[PDB]
Amino acid sequence: SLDDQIFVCEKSIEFAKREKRVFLKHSLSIKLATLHYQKKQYKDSLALINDLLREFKKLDDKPSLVDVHLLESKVYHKLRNLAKSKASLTAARTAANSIYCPTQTVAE
Amino acid sequence: RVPNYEVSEKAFLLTQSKVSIEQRKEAAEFVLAKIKEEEMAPYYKYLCEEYLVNNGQSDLEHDEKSDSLNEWIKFDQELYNELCKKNESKIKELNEKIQKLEEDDEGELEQAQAWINLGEYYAQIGDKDNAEKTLGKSLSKAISTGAKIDVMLTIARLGFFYNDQLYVKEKLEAVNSMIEKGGDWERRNRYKTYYGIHCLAVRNFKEAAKLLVDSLATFTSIELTSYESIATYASVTGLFTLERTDLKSKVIDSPELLSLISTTAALQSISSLTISLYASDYASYFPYLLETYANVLIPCKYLNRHADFFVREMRRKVYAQLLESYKTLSLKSMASAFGVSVAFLDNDLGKFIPNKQLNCVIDRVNGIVETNRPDNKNAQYHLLVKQGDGLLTKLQKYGAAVRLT
Amino acid sequence: MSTDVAAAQAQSKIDLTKKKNEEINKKSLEEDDEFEDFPIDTWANGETIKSNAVTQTNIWEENWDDVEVDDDFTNELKAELDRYKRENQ
Amino acid sequence: LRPGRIDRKIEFPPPSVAARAEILRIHSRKMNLTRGINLRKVAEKMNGCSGADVKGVCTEAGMYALRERRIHVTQEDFELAVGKVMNKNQETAISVAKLFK
């Protein structure tokens, strides 16, 4: 069930800032956005991707924050605009000027 | 500032009896609450006055008739007591502010800023009159160039509120003189959105579609109206003016309109209608059209005026596509296809054919709809001679007149 | 609006002192101005401004949809009567 | 040749950060003004040896905005634009910054 998987991310993420590091807390954010993309609510998915895009633009070098840009492309795709999907493909490309970013990312 | 577009739309529904009382009685409850909160009592006087007869009878400023079915447009005497009290609290603060900052250094800029605030407070309570004066003093003395354009657009904003076409027009004229002096892209975007609405109220939709479709792509909501109203208002005026090829480019394959998806009932209504026109479906077009009118045109103040024209033209446009593509139809097949009958179709066609829109006849005897749209030289020659005949007359008047003196 | 382009005939012919005797002279045989006569006679001409949205003064360009009766009530009717007919076809 | 032999010897300095920012100042009006006033970003990140390098940012910035189909220049359009112009210089500066003696 979509519901329960979503619930386990909610417990973890609160715990991720008063027992654990920030690094974990922004990872679980993608996870939430990934399953809302499965549930077929786009308002939720986009809204999480915006929070990551802005705050960790300063802290962008992470293989984890390439995935943010990819997911963003996958959401603008399903909204049927391929101007901003392309644009956010192009953003992903800059943040993986590297071909030494994790292989799974590259395949995506 | 902000609550003006909200109040106006909500206030309009009440007047209209083509919309269901369920929507109206909701609308009033939201807006009555805003009316005490923001002190919109001067605008509230304007509303019951302007109709007059058919709503705005149940008040304490009118003698009560059965004509009005809102009593949520009915004043309190409490309302006036706060009105005055608030008016004094705020206005008094701002005066002290002018008298303080005549002493302190650089009064050209500071005094002007308190006169900018006087307009804000007047915009808040919905009295455009005393606002006109205070923003005029702000323009006159030294402020930033782009801020002069913001000051004008605020004046014009109040003109949409009351809904005088002649006042908004003049305010927008000073903006478009000042538009390239400031060079501002920021108040140029703002200009398309404001000037969008004015063109929407004009019967001219060609300039309304050019501004309102462009303003989708980079849209400003800093001291502006919602994107929800503009995406709908933009689709309507694009549907009329654009032809099938450009319809596809600028409405349907618009990435911005796509991304907004179906989240307002209005948006859903006009979206349906363009697609079904495009993909050549006729069965479903007839009930879509009805829904678009009910939920979109009417609630809107500015398309109330163009409501009737929309229905006529829309039928005319779907007929045009069909009539072009066929030499002959049956009265049977055409009627069934749109989803009406033989008796109904005969009336729909008796409107537009004697006006010479569709250029077609219906054989009643045979049972067919024959097509006789001229595309030949004869059609073309007629267009040409109409241009030269307006010339020959205009030469005759200018020529003669000079000959005498 | 008067024949052709009204704005061209406005621009063409203006007041002069030469033209003043002539304008009057013309007007008097026709008799009176028949724009200030009328409202005395009829007790006001009631031009709609509460019944149209392009008034009787003409704000911009007029709808010709005020010659017809609102045809939305008619199409709404037309549709329903077909659904029942359609059903039982 | 010799100083003052044709009178007036005036060396033109390479521009300071404050000067780079002013050279940038004027091109911004000509372009669409940035959202978020990120003018200082460019100026801090690098300082050139020419008024040409500054100018090079303006043009570079409009390649990226054009593609995104957004007119207005932004911080993101800027970050890509300063990275492109600084690329030319970082590469010749890593070879004396690394693998040296």
From Swiss-Prot, chain A:
Modifications the protein undergoes after translation, according to the UniProt entry: N-acetylated by NAT1.
Binding partners and assembly: Component of the lid subcomplex of the 19S proteasome regulatory particle complex (also named PA700 complex). The 26S proteasome consists of a 20S proteasome core and two 19S regulatory subunits.
Role, per record: Component of the lid subcomplex of the 26S proteasome, a multiprotein complex involved in the ATP-dependent degradation of ubiquitinated proteins. In the complex, RPN6 is required for proteasome assembly.
Membership in a protein family: Belongs to the proteasome subunit S9 family.
Note: Present with 16800 molecules/cell in log phase SD medium.
Protein name (record): 26S proteasome regulatory subunit RPN6
From Swiss-Prot, chain B:
Record-listed Phosphoserine modification sites: S58
Cited InterPro entries: PCI_dom, Rpn7/CSN1, Rpn7_N, RPN7_PSMD6_C, TPR-like_helical_dom_sf, TPR_rpt, WH_DNA-bd_sf
Limits of the PCI domain: 204-376
Signal peptide residues on this chain, from the entry's feature table: none
GO CC terms, sorted: nucleus; proteasome complex; proteasome regulatory particle; proteasome regulatory particle, lid subcomplex
Keyword Coiled coil part of the UniProt annotation: no
GO biological process, one term: ubiquitin-dependent protein catabolic process
Keyword Ubl conjugation: no
GO molecular function annotations of the record: structural molecule activity
UniProt xrefs under SMART domains: PINT
Lineage top rank: taxon: Eukaryota
Additional remark text: Present with 51900 molecules/cell in log phase SD medium.
Task performed by this protein: Component of the 19S cap proteasome complex which acts as a regulatory subunit of the 26S proteasome, involved in the ATP-dependent degradation of ubiquitinated proteins.
Complex formation: The 26S proteasome is composed of a core protease, known as the 20S proteasome, capped at one or both ends by the 19S regulatory complex (RC). The RC is composed of at least 18 different subunits in two subcomplexes, the base and the lid, which form the portions proximal and distal to the 20S proteolytic core, respectively. Component of the lid subcomplex of the 19S RC.
Protein's name in the database: 26S proteasome regulatory subunit RPN7
Organism: Saccharomyces cerevisiae (strain ATCC 204508 / S288c)
Taxonomic lineage of the native organism: Eukaryota, Fungi, Dikarya, Ascomycota, Saccharomycotina
Gene label: RPN7
From Swiss-Prot, chain C:
Record-linked InterPro entries: DSS1_SEM1
Disruption phenotype: Impairs mRNA export and transcription elongation, and induces strong transcription-associated hyperrecombination phenotypes.
CDD domains: DSS1_Sem1 (cd13768)
One of the record's GO molecular function terms: protein folding chaperone
Sites bearing N-acetylserine, chain numbering: S2
Keywords, alphabetical: Acetylation, Phosphoprotein, Proteasome, Transcription
Modified residues (Phosphoserine): S12
One example of a Gene Ontology biological process annotation: proteasome assembly
GO cellular component: cytosol; proteasome complex; proteasome regulatory particle, lid subcomplex; proteasome storage granule; transcription export complex 2
Anything else known: Present with 5590 molecules/cell in log phase SD medium.
Similarity field: Belongs to the DSS1/SEM1 family.
Function, as annotated: Versatile protein that might stabilize multiple protein complexes involved in diverse pathways. Subunit of the 26S proteasome which plays a role in ubiquitin-dependent proteolysis. Also associates with the TREX-2 complex that is required for transcription-coupled mRNA export, and the COP9 signalosome, which is involved in deneddylation.
Subunit field text: Part of the 26S proteasome. Associates with the nuclear pore complex (NPC)-associated TREX-2 complex and the COP9 signalosome. Interacts with CSN12 and THP3.
Annotated protein name in UniProt: 26S proteasome complex subunit SEM1
Organism: Saccharomyces cerevisiae (strain ATCC 204508 / S288c)
Swiss-Prot record, chain D:
GO CC, alphabetical: nucleus; proteasome complex; proteasome regulatory particle, base subcomplex; proteasome storage granule
Function: The 26S proteasome is involved in the ATP-dependent degradation of ubiquitinated proteins. The regulatory (or ATPase) complex confers ATP dependency and substrate specificity to the 26S complex.
Any one Gene Ontology BP term: chromatin remodeling
Complete-protein stretch covered: 305 to 405 of 405
PTM per Swiss-Prot/TrEMBL: N-acetylated by NAT1.
Main location: cytoplasm
Subunit structure: May form a homodimer or a heterodimer with a related family member. Interacts with OLA1, TMA17, and UBR1.
Cell compartment(s), UniProt: Cytoplasm; Nucleus
Keyword Ribosomal protein in record: no
Extra facts: Present with 4700 molecules/cell in log phase SD medium.
Identification of the protein by name: 26S proteasome regulatory subunit 8 homolog
Family: Belongs to the AAA ATPase family.
Alphabetic keyword roster: Acetylation, ATP-binding, Cytoplasm, Nucleotide-binding, Nucleus, Proteasome
